[PDB]
Amino acid sequence: SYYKGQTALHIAIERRNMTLVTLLVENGADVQAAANGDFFKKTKGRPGFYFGELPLS
Amino acid sequence: SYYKGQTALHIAIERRNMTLVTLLVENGADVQAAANGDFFKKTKGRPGFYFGELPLSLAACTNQLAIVKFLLQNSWQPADISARDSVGNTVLHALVEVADNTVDNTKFVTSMYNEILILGAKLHPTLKLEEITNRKGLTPLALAASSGKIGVLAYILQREIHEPECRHLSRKFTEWAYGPVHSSLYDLSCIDTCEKNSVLEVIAYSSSETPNRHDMLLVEPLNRLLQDKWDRFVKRIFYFNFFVYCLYMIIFTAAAYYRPVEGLPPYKLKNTVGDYFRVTGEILSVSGGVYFFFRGIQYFLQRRPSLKSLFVDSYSEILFFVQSLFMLVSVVLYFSQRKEYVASMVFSLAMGWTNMLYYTRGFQQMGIYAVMIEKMILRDLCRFMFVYLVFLFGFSTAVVTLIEDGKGNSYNSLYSTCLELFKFTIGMGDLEFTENYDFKAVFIILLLAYVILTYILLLNMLIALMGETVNKIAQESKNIWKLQRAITILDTEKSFLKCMRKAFRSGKLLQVGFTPDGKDDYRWCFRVDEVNWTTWN
Amino acid sequence: MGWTNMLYYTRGFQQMGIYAVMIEKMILRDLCRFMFVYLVFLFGFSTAVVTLIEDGKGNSYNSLYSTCLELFKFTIGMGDLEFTENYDFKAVFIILLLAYVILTYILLLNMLIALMGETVNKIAQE
Numbered sequence: 110s111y112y113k114g115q116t117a118l119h120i121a122i123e124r125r126n127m128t129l130v131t132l133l134v135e136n137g138a139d140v141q142a143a144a145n146g147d148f149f150k151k152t153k154g155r156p157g158f159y160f161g162e163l164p165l166s
Numbered sequence: 167s168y169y170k171g172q173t174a175l176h177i178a179i180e181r182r183n184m185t186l187v188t189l190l191v192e193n194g195a196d197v198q199a200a201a202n203g204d205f206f207k208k209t210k211g212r213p214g215f216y217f218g219e220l221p222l223s224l225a226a227c228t229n230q231l232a233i234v235k236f237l238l239q240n241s242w243q244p245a246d247i248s249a250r251d252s253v254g255n256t257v258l259h260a261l262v263e264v265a266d267n268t269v270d271n272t273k274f275v276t277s278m279y280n281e282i283l284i285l286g287a288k289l290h291p292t293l294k295l296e297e298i299t300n301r302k303g304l305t306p307l308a309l310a311a312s313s314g315k316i317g318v319l320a321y322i323l324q325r326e327i328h329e330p331e332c333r334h335l336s337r338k339f340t341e342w343a344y345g346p347v348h349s350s351l352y353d354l355s356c357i358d359t360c361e362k363n364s365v366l367e368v369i370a371y372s373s374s375e376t377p378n379r380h381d382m383l384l385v386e387p388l389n390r391l392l393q394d395k396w397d398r399f400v401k402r403i404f405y406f407n408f409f410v411y412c413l414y415m416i417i418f419t420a421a422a423y424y425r426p427v428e429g430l431p432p433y434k435l436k437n438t439v440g441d442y443f444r445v446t447g448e449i450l451s452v453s454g455g456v457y458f459f460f461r462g463i464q465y466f467l468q469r470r471p472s473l474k475s476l477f478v479d480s481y482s483e484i485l486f487f488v489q490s491l492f493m494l495v496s497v498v499l500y501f502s503q504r505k506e507y508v509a510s511m512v513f514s515l516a517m518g519w520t521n522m523l524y525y526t527r528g529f530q531q532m533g534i535y536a537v538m539i540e541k542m543i544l545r546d547l548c549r550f551m552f553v554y555l556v557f558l559f560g561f562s563t564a565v566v567t568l569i570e571d572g573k574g575n576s577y578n579s580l581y582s583t584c585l586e587l588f589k590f591t592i593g594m595g596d597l598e599f600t601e602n603y604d605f606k607a608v609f610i611i612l613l614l615a616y617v618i619l620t621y622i623l624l625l626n627m628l629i630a631l632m633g634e635t636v637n638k639i640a641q642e643s644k645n646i647w648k649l650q651r652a653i654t655i656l657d658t659e660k661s662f663l664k665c666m667r668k669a670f671r672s673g674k675l676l677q678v679g680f681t682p683d684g685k686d687d688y689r690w691c692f693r694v695d696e697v698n699w700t701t702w703n
Numbered sequence: 704m705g706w707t708n709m710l711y712y713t714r715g716f717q718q719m720g721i722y723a724v725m726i727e728k729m730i731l732r733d734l735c736r737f738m739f740v741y742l743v744f745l746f747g748f749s750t751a752v753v754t755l756i757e758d759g760k761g762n763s764y765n766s767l768y769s770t771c772l773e774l775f776k777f778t779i780g781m782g783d784l785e786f787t788e789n790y791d792f793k794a795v796f797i798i799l800l801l802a803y804v805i806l807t808y809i810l811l812l813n814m815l816i817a818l819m820g821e822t823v824n825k826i827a828q829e
């Protein structure tokens with residue numbers, strides 16, 4: 110399903126709010142989340158842009 | 167009388183003194199004053215400028231923000247914003263009229279446009295102020311498109327509002343922005359060929375008089391939509407028509423090439439297969455010719471194209487019509503037991519083959535070549551031909567006067583000498599083709615002067631002018647090819663009016679926002695993804 | 704082909720290499736389009752002419768090859784405006800030949816030179 114590769118950390122980083130992401134990860138949120146979704150794939154003929162599965166990426 | 171349409175309010179607004187006008191109107195001055203004077207009429211050949219009969223229209227055409235704000239918010243006699251004037255131009259129409267390509271005028275007539283639009287929304291949220299048409303029947307969008315107001319069009323097709331309540335009076339509904347990538351929906355409410363006078367139809371069928379008519383189509387929404395339609399459902403039909411025309415030209419060529427040369431026309435129907443195939447070719451050619459004739463007549467009636475300059479926008483259609491007319495004349499003569507139909511048929515054949523260049527507008531690099539080949543014909547070849555004919559006729563008359571032939575002997579005729587000098591022009595001229603003159607020095611001097619003036623000066627000059635023209639009009643040719651393809655798309659999708667329409671529709675019916683009436687906004691939006699790395703908000 | 708392929712070796716020299724690159728860019732960019740349009744015009748007017756010719760009596764000019772070759776000779780500046788008198792209407796023949804000369808010799812070749820100038824100015828650095 111589409112809404113399983115993403116995690117709250119991914120969208121929090123999308124908002125670029127440092128406080129929100131540090132609050133999210135303070136409890137010990139997984140940092141190895143992989144966004145293995147077609148929306149994130151490198152294909153240029155489809156919407157979205159590939160940036161890397163890891164939230165660090 | 168002249169001094170009755172005006173009122174003290176009009177001149178007070180002219181001075182742009184807010185205090186004076188508010189003092190004038192405080193007593194309850196009429197706000198419906200109409201300046202129905204010829205001085206205020208739209209005519210550009212006479213002094214004065216039309217701004218709108220209503221004083222609110224005069225204030226709006228001017229940058230008088232305060233006057234409009236106060237009059238639209240006054241406690242007594244608030245003027246009706248939706249007001250058909252004498253010409254029918256609502257204040258928005260007058261704003262479009264006053265708009266020019268100037269940057270500052272665009273700024274004013276764009277900021278004030280937005281402000282008065284929102285003010286009218288506040289006054290009558292359920293009033294279609296931007297759908298009110300003048301006597302001509304065009305809304306402000308259509309009026310701007312017809313008058314070539316590019317700035318206003320770019321604003322309206324990209325009008326955006328961030329206020330949630332009044333954002334519904336917007337054209338582009340931004341959907342989302344996941345990082346630098348964000349979609350951009352549009353409206354397409356009247357852009358498509360789905361209303362009485364559409365923007366695309368207005369741009370396509372507007373004469374060359376309106377400025378920048380081929381530059382307006384460079385706006386992002388229109389360009390993307392046109393390329394979408396072409397790539398989706400018009401390229402295949404264009405290629406099919408191109409193939410069918412190729413087949414028709416081949417059939418015409420094969421039928422004319424094998425024409426009987428014995429016995430005056432009409433000719434017998436033999437029992438051989440060859441004669442049957444020849445008759446099939448002839449009848450197919452005639453059918454194509456009559457079809458093109460009727461198509462040209464339909465074009466003339468539907469468009470009623472400009473009679474001032476119809477060789478600049480309807481060249482190819484004119485050529486197709488001429489080919490069809492020549493073929494019809496050939497058919498008329500062939501059945502009159504006359505053998506002059508060969509000339510008409512040959513002319514039609516050559517015209518048809520040269521008209522295959524009409525189909526190079528489906529390809530982005532050959533279309534520019536065809537546009538340049540037509541711009542250099544109507545711009546550079548005509549002038550050179552005029553001057554060259556003057557020189558050729560002068561020197562040919564000189565020469566034939568010199569020739570006496572009192573003894574390569576029947577060179578007295580002006581035709582022979584003119585042909586000889588033209589041969590000189592194409593590099594096949596004999597400087598001693600005849601010795602019937604009486605003074606060789608004069609003959610040689612005349613021929614040398616002709617060669618110097620035409621072969622060494624005029625043709626080299628023509629090449630130089632062609633270089634200058636190419637460097638100047640590369641971009642204009644690109645834009646003209648885009649416009650030509652747009653007209654082709656319009657005609658293609660119109661041809662199937664009775665065939666089918668449902669699948670011949672662009673955009674997707676979307677519901678993003680609501681109206682102040684607590685209802686939906688079902689509009690045919692068209693996505694355009696963008697990626698910006700500096701906005702970031 | 705082998706003799707014309709000696710130009711492959713002009714890429715070791717800094718000034719002839721640019722000439723070879725330009726000669727290949729103008730072949731794939733400017734000569735192809737001109738050849739397309741010129742062939743269209745030549746074929747059209749040649750079919751017109753061979754249709755005009757009757758030869759019911761410089762006699763076997765009915766073949767399309769001969770007329771196409773004659774009009775190409777016109778293009779290289781060796782065209783005879785009266786190579787044959789087998790037609791039935793001289794005015795039509797002369798009008799067709801004049802139209803061909805005007806459209807190809809005086810408009811298309813001069814236009815080709817102009818486009819070559821534009822292309823050279825544009826693609827020197829490329």
Ligand SMILES: COc1cccc(NC(=O)/C=C/c2ccc(Cl)cc2)c1
Pocket residue numbers: 481482485513516517520521523524536539540798799802
């Ligand atoms: C639309 O595409 C184009 C663009 C430029 C030129 C042309 N063809 C002509 O002008 C052909 C002219 C002509 C006139 C008389 C005779 Cl007897 C033969 C030929 C087509």
